């Protein structure tokens, strides 16, 4: 909104209170919006044994449809925005302005693929708190959207040509970060909770678990027109808000359809001690702060 002439501001997207704030806001939204029929949460320490907190309540079938959220300055603070079209989120920003509010952010909860978000204005961008650390998530921001169309009938469709173009662009960016003589390999999730091993999201109020192996099974710098991912709608889920399990009622609609735009990805690199000149990347995610981080990386709040 108002450009700060000749001002240089340090940004750190990995330590940003706006992310924590949004996270608590979305947790509240979901707790008041999507009520489980049964909720089971652990409770330990004291005497020795563990306990389980159980809540049972009416669980109305509702159609969840994210509305954009705008974050404006909290009392006593100002929001600064980095204007650099290609900014990695961590370091000095030479083109910074003050804004009244963030742009409208749809609080989409998902793993692996980031949906309905903002595209990079220039080239594909990759971001990590530490690329050398294989345990740290890589946030990818695409410059071109890829449609993913899903049905409660048990699958999602993605255009193979579009996805392949996308992969080439990501791989090029990854070898630009890890080495130009590196072969870039994409592989399926190596394991963990279902919400993390599959592309997991909510559509029409139902929780989808889509097998993403076909999206992450290629080698770069070493088919059919449509990629069809098999999916499963589940009633018993691991909650993202905290370490709990929830049960929901089965679906009541026979026509569940969602079409989203893939605008980013959450990846991790295998790494490990290897003299081999290749790098393996797998879909990741699970910590929804990374989802919020993918949108808030260019903002920070400062004391006035």
């Amino acid at each position: 909104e108002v450009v700060l002439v000749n001002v240089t501001e340090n940004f750190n997207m990995w330590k940003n209170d706006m992310v924590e704030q949004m996270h608590e806001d979305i947790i509240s939204l979901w707790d008041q919006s999507l009520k489980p029929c049964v909720k089971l949460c652990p409770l330990c320490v004291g005497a020795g044994s563990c306990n389980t907190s159980v809540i049972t309540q009416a669980c109305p079938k509702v159609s969840f449809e994210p509305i954009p959220i705008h974050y404006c300055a909290p009392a006593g603070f100002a929001i600064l925005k980095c204007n650099n079209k290609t900014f990695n989120g961590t370091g000095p920003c030479t083109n910074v302005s003050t804004v009244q509010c963030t742009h409208g952010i749809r609080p989409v909860v998902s793993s692996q693929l980031l949906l309905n978000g903002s595209l990079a204005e220039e080239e594909v961008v990759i971001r990590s708190v530490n690329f050398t650390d294989n345990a740290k998530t890589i946030i990818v921001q695409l410059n071109t959207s890829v449609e993913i169309n899903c049905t409660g009938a048990g699958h999602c469709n993605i255009a193979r040509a579009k996805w392949n173009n996308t992969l080439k662009q990501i791989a090029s960016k990854l070898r630009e970060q890890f080495g130009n003589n590196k072969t870039i390999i994409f592989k399926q999730s190596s394991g963990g909770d279902p919400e993390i091993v599959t592309h997991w999201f909510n559509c029409g109020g139902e929780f989808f678990y889509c097998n993403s192996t076909q999206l992450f099974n290629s080698t770069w710098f070493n088919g059919s027109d449509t990629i069809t991912l098999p999916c499963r709608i589940k009633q018993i889920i691991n909650m993202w808000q905290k370490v709990c399990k929830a049960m929901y009622a089965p679906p009541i609609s026979g026509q569940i359809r969602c079409s989203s735009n893939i605008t980013g990805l959450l990846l991790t690199r295998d790494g490990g001690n290897s003299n081999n000149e290749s790098e393996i990347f797998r879909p990741g995610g699970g910590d929804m702060r990374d989802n919020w981080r993918s949108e808030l990386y260019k903002y920070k709040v400062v004391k006035i």
Partner: antibody
Amino acid sequence: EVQLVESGAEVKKPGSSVKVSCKASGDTFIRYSFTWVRQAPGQGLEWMGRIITILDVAHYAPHLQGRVTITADKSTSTVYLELRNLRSDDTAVYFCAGVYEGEADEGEYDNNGFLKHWGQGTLVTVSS
Amino acid sequence: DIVMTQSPATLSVSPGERATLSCRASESVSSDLAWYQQKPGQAPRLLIYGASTRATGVPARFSGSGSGAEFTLTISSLQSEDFAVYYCQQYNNWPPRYTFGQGTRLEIKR
């Protein structure tokens, strides 16, 4: 399909507690929910409660809430009903029953409230 | 609680003829309604669930219909093994507080 075999008849004085069991054989235990239903002599069926076996969570009829506990031992595929502070009017045949809920181990759960499989019943007589 | 009422209390039907049994709920239970058959000294047997779906092993002559608060079980031609007591059960509520009707006794009219 599961086969349900219940423990033998019980005789109790009023004020006692009783614990009846039901062994489920023949299918995968955690894909079933189990329900206890009782029937006093000459009377109808009364729903007592139901356990969501995979979650180890049970829900009970309001008139019994407080003195009934339903549990399940996954290791022995056995379901238990405990009824406390017994009254003479708790005299009944107690049935274990169950229904398949879907691929529960993969997160599919129909939460079926009807009852396909039934045990042979256990007579519990409560009297002075 | 949801009260289930069956009528009549006793139904007398000549062998080979049709029987119609009624179940009423004190409020809507949608289609979450099951029918059971019980013979003396035996456990109940599931006949119908979801108001109209026959359970496995149930002959076609058994038919369930209705929705909301009014349901019917029809037996098109009574065989000797069909004479028994029949119960309806609602399982619509959550938290679960499922209830049974008080039964209709179907006996042989001679």
